[model samples]
Target: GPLGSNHIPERWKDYLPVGQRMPGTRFIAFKVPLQKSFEKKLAPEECFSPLDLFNKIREQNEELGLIIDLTYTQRYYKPEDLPETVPYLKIFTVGHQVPDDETIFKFKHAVNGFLKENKDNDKLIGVHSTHGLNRTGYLICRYLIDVEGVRPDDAIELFNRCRGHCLERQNYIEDLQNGPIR
Candidate 1:
């Protein structure tokens, strides 16, 4: 077994509330989807595996057209683990610092590509990081600020409210307030 699989993610218990889609964006946020291996130590009701995520979306009567994975590693889950209908893209973002320009550009392009192809439906683009608050909020808000031209405060607020958790890192929030503005 891989190391850390037996241990629950640090502070992971706090982010358990899976939130609704943001008000003005085709985005939804959640913690990284865990594989069954990672779920071995969790209770039956505490599981948030890929299939659980799929069922959660179904219960909401919403479709996830795409899932953008920003976690640095693939150990938690794989693309195949996602629903058969949801397309997957991995942008492998490093955590703890703001994502670099190249990473940001890739993220923007990935979102743009999905939106361009998904004009007919309101299907959301699901996004997640390890905890799904900081990095997830940053990239989703970055796209909102740079592409959608939404106000930084408004964008962050929308994400915070929808995700059921605000972006926690000071540096990430500061940049969202100030901006790369690209």
Candidate 2:
């Protein structure tokens, strides 16, 4: 489960309420689970379908704007596939299982790029992954807490309340309690 699977809205209408409530970032990065190994399904073409997802967003709001679909696998969709009306940029990063330090580095860098592009606007930056915990949440949580300077305590609280999990790996938590990053 990436955010409990059901968390990913099938229709665009359901996202409107949330978008309206939190217009700070207005950008939602969604993640769909991709099989690490699959014959027919894991193709990059299927993985990165920015146009398809934007079409979903467009159906709900005529004003639906930037939509950047990111993934660990870079082979998926391309800039050409993005909808002309809606602004979007797909970020290539790692997913599934725990990422190595290098992967985290890349993920953080890309997320920073996202923030840099949308900092002035108080739009909601939505990150949706089926399950919403695990690595999907870890990389994002790190981006928010570390890069964005979102309060760590508050982020963890939200994580617990909304998903009942911490972004830090279990062992990492122990290490942090003993002073990991200082």
Candidate 3:
């Protein structure tokens, strides 16, 4: 609510409800949409510009923060364009492809470490993607249910508020018959 952008405002949930923020100050997890390259300017101003997002954070709060971008394509954002708001970790997985067990393991470990480290701090975490469906949606769903211990049913609904029909494609019947991710 504090941030001017109604699209993604700062709220108690955005930041930790009751602690200090940490080193990788915030997490920006999103499913990157198709982009030609970092050189080509992205259209649709309604979308987020990494530079603009971090710049606003620094300018408004007068604090240096890190952005952890987990996407498949690197053409969207380049390192040179982001010298000041340097990220702590930038991991890219196979685009439009199924993540292997190793990839999932690494991702889970990285997330666990980050959350564990920042547990007391209660830092701001930004997790999103272009449409917030499919890969991005599943990741968020897994995180909420696995890491935060939220009800699997509620997790899907929570993501919906951020992006409409986030988990629409999911086979709920199959999942319910089986169980959540490992």
Candidate 4:
């Protein structure tokens, strides 16, 4: 980790480990993967590195098809740390703003393509951004609402229950609840 990711992300402690696939969607959420630099800062039981994430997925008898990182920095961890068989994508979404159309479009295409080829299995598209509850939940829920034809309230609740954390930002919740479709 360099200056960008040298310190732990703000409020990262508020969240926990990997999330389950949203009941009817091929999406799951988790906090951004920390590099080796971050591992040294936490206790053995607390560190959650990239490899640790994969193991967590396996522990659940699940597999990941892709990791869509929405954090706005590059120093947290390198894609080299990810399993070579899984693909990686970065959307560089700002932490404060709700994701824009362009960001949503990029996410949609990547996920659509992944879901296209992996039709016979339950492999997931891993989604994370910083702490993985807000930006992460927003986009995951967005796709469910926009593309999967799920109701907004149900989508939000599904993500909260599956991720073991509620989406914390009011603005994101509001948009997903009542705002116009993107």
Which number leads on TM-score? Answer: 4
Q: What is the lDDT of every predicted structure here?
A: 0.83, 0.42, 0.45, 0.86
**Winner by TM-score between candidate 2 and candidate 1:** 1
Please write out the lDDT profile of model 1 over residues 95-138, one tens digit for every residue: 58888888889888888898999888899889888888998999
Name the TM-score of candidate 2.
0.46
Report the lDDT tens digits of candidate 2 across residue range 65-108. 34434453323334454455444444443444444566557666
Each candidate structure's TM-score, on Cα atoms with residue i matched to residue i, is 0.92, 0.46, 0.57, 0.93
For each of the candidates, give the backbone clash count.
0, 18, 4, 0
On lDDT, the stronger of 1 and 2 is 1
Models sorted by TM-score, best on top: 4, 1, 3, 2
Please report the TM-score between candidate 3 and the true structure: 0.57
RMSD in angstroms, all models?
A: 1.9, 9.0, 9.9, 1.9
Q: Per-residue alpha-carbon lDDT of model 4 for 31-127, expressed as tens digits?
A: 9878887766677877788888999889888889999999875588888767557899989888577889999889999999998999999999999
Shift in Å, residue 57, candidate 2: 4.0
For residue 109, give model 3's deviation from the true position in Å.
1.6
